[PDB]
C-alpha cells in the first residue's frame, strides 16, 4: 500500500530579504520510494536543485531532502511541488518565512 508524503518547506538560516540562503523541501513518510520533487520560484521551476539520496527511517518510510540556493526578496514566492503515486494530483506547499 501507498503511504502519502509529508512536506515541510523552510530555509536553513533565518531569512533576511536580500541575504542569500538555502531553501529546503523536506519530504518524508512516503512509499513507494519513487517520487518527483520540484522547487518553484514565482510558479516557475528552479533549474538546478540538490537532491539528497534515497533513505529510509526505522518505520520503513522513505524521506528525501531537496534544497537550493535562494535569495529571498520582499515579493517573490517560493514553493515545493511533489508528485507521487499516493496522490492523484501534484501537491504544492508554499514557503512561509514565519513557520
Amino acid at each position: 500500500i501507498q503511504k502519502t508524503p509529508q512536506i515541510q518547506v523552510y530555509s536553513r538560516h533565518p531569512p533576511e530579504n536580500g541575504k542569500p540562503n538555502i531553501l529546503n523541501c523536506y519530504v518524508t513518510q512516503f512509499h513507494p520510494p519513487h517520487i518527483e520533487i520540484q522547487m518553484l520560484k514565482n510558479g516557475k521551476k528552479i533549474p538546478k536543485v540538490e537532491m539528497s539520496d534515497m533513505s529510509f527511517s526505522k518505520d520503513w518510510s522513505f524521506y528525501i531532502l531537496a534544497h537550493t540556493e535562494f535569495t529571498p526578496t520582499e515579493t517573490d514566492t517560493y514553493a515545493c511541488r511533489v508528485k507521487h503515486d499516493s496522490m492523484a494530483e501534484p501537491k504544492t506547499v508554499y514557503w512561509d518565512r514565519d513557520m
Binding site: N24, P32, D53, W60, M99
Partner: protein, 276 residues
C-alpha cells in the same frame, strides 16, 4: 555515550525495469557512514564521512563483494515474494532490511536488530533473543519455517554479537573526535500578531544534533496538549536540525508564557520567554 550501528538495505523492482536496484546504507550513531548503489556507473561501497577514508582498499573490495551477493539475495527474495503473495508481473515492489547492533555506554552489546519488510510492511523479524522469528503475515510463514529449519538465526546471531560489535568498536575509535560530542540547540521566541487581540508565540530551536528534542509551552507552570502547534523535526541541511512550537496568546498577557527546551547536549533544559 551509548552507540549503535545499522545497515539499511533496499531493493526496488519497477514494472519494466530489467533488474531490481539494490541500495545499502550504513549508519554509525545514526550518521550515514558508507553507501552502495547498483545504479552507480561503477557500483562500489564509497565512504560517506571524512574519517572513513582511513580504510585500505581491501576493506572496500570485501564490502563491495558482500554488496554484490546481497544484490543477488534481494533479487531471488523479491522473485519468491511475488509468488508468495500471488502478485502477477508488471507492478512495483520493495524489499527492505535493517540489521545492526546497539551498545551501552560500557560499549557492551545491548540489542541486535534484524528485520525485513515487504512493500513497506513488516514481513519477518529476528526477536530480541536472537533465536526466534516473528512474522505476522500468512505468506510470511513459509519463510519463518525455511529459516527455522536451516538455523538462519544462529548465522545472524553470530554477526550481530561478533562482527557488528567488533567493527563498531573499530569505527568508533577511528573517528573518536568526529562523533564524541553533540551540538546543543540555540533557542529564541518570535512574535506574530494575527487576529484582533491575539498573538502567536513561536518558540524556535535551531542548530542542534542529534535530532531528538522536546519543546513545551507552559502557562506559568501548566503545559498544553490544548492546541499547541508544532512541526516535525527537520534538517537544516548542514548536518544540524530545527524544530519549533507555537501557541495562541492574548496580546499583552504574554510573559506568563514560558517555552522549555530539552535536548541531550544540554547541561539542563532551557527556559525561555518572549523578549521584546
Amino acid at each position: 555515550g551509548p552507540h549503535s550501528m545499522r545497515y539499511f538495505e533496499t531493493a526496488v523492482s519497477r514494472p519494466g525495469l530489467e533488474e531490481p536496484r539494490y541500495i545499502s546504507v550504513g549508519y554509525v550513531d545514526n550518521k550515514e557512514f558508507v553507501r552502495f548503489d547498483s545504479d552507480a556507473e561503477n557500483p562500489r561501497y564509497e565512504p560517506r564521512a571524512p574519517w572513513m577514508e582511513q580504510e585500505g582498499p581491501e576493506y572496500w573490495e570485501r564490502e563491495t563483494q558482500k554488496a554484490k551477493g546481497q544484490e543477488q539475495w534481494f533479487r531471488v527474495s523479491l522473485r519468491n515474494l511475488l509468488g508468495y503473495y500471488n502478485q502477477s508481473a508488471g507492478g512495483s515492489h520493495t524489499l527492505q532490511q535493517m540489521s545492526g547492533c546497539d551498545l551501552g555506554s560500557d560499549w557492551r552489546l545491548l540489542r541486535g536488530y534484524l528485520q525485513f519488510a515487504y512493500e513497506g510492511r513488516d514481513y519477518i523479524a529476528l526477536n530480541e533473543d536472537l533465536k526466534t522469528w516473528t512474522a505476522a503475515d500468512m505468506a510470511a510463514q513459509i519463510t519463518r519455517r525455511k529459516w527455522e529449519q536451516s538455523g538462519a538465526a544462529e548465522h545472524y546471531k553470530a554477526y550481530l554479537e561478533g562482527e557488528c560489535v567488533e567493527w563498531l568498536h573499530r569505527y568508533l575509535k577511528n573517528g573518536n573526535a568526529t562523533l564524541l560530542r553533540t551540538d546543543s540547540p540555540k533557542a529564541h521566541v518570535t512574535h506574530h500578531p494575527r487576529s484582533k487581540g491575539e498573538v502567536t508565540l513561536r518558540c524556535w530551536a535551531l542548530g542542534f544534533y542529534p535530532a531528538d528534542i522536546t519543546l513545551t509551552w507552559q502557562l506559568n507552570g501548566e503545559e498544553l496538549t490544548q492546541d499547541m502547534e508544532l512541526v516535525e523535526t527537520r534538517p537544516a541541511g548542514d548536518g544540524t536540525f530545527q524544530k519549533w512550537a507555537s501557541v495562541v496568546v492574548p496580546l499583552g498577557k504574554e510573559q506568563n508564557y514560558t517555552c522549555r527546551v530539552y535536548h541531550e547536549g544540554l547541561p539542563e533544559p532551557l527556559t525561555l520567554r518572549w523578549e521584546p
